[PDB]
Amino acid sequence: MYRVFVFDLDGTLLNDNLEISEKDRRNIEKLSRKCYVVFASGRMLVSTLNVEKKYFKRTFPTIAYNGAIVYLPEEGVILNEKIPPEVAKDIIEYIKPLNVHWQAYIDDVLYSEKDNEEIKSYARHSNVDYRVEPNLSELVSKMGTTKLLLIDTPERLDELKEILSERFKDVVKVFKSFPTYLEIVPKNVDKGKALRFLRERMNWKKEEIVVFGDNENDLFMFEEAGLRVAMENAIEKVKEASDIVTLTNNDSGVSYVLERISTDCLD
Numbered sequence: 001m002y003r004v005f006v007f008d009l010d011g012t013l014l015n016d017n018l019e020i021s022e023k024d025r026r027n028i029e030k031l032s033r034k035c036y037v038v039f040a041s042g043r044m045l046v047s048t049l050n051v052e053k054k055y056f057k058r059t060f061p062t063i064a065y066n067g068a069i070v071y072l073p074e075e076g077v078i079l080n081e082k083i084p085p086e087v088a089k090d091i092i093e094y095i096k097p098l099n100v101h102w103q104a105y106i107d108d109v110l111y112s113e114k115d116n117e118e119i120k121s122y123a124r125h126s127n128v129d130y131r132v133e134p135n136l137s138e139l140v141s142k143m144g145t146t147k148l149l150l151i152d153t154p155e156r157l158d159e160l161k162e163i164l165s166e167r168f169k170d171v172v173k174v175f176k177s178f179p180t181y182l183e184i185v186p187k188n189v190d191k192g193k194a195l196r197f198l199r200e201r202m203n204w205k206k207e208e209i210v211v212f213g214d215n216e217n218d219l220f221m222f223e224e225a226g227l228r229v230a231m232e233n234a235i236e237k238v239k240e241a242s243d244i245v246t247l248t249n250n251d252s253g254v255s256y257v258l259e260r261i262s263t264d265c266l267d
């Protein structure tokens, strides 16, 4: 039997309109009684906890920033991976002379040096609030950051990616999230390491854990679970590593399999 249920949000529990169907909501509600529910997302911690409170008036053990943050409703953040203020300072001092548009994620708040069109459109599309801080260099250099993000034309961004990777590949992870978004994040952090950490903390055993995913990012969690469910919309690689491929996230792919799994709770 299974007693721990891990769900990615985007492309999984959330449909393409970023909402959770009533069917999936009700099934989670039933499990949450007596059993453990875990949400794992690449989104900010606040954004993730907000979805939790919106559909369920509470919070659950949570994996945010794709593994950098592990949160427990009672303890709060018990894992907080970030770019060390040193490598962070080096990156900022290196990047500024290059006149680019960068923003920083600090203590769960998105900051941008200048209030331009780049930031406006990014916060809009990845729906999050941001704050303009001209002195962001000092904020980061002295407070540390979960991650940095550069926004430019796919052209210049492909070039920036090139030089920042060659220069910092050794102490940080640099990759394009999309044609116009370049991200810099803590080296070896991912959803799998975060889930394994949570497991050690909570004393979960792999055999009682189920994970639902659709991502390359979620593939890491699969190694830490006893049962693996890929969404029908998952990339080919994820489906081939799963045990079962349920319906799409636009339907209630989660419920479709969730209702058939051998589980404690619900008696």
Ligand SMILES: [Mg+2]
Pocket: 008, 009, 010, 011, 012, 214, 215
């Ligand atoms: Mg996803």
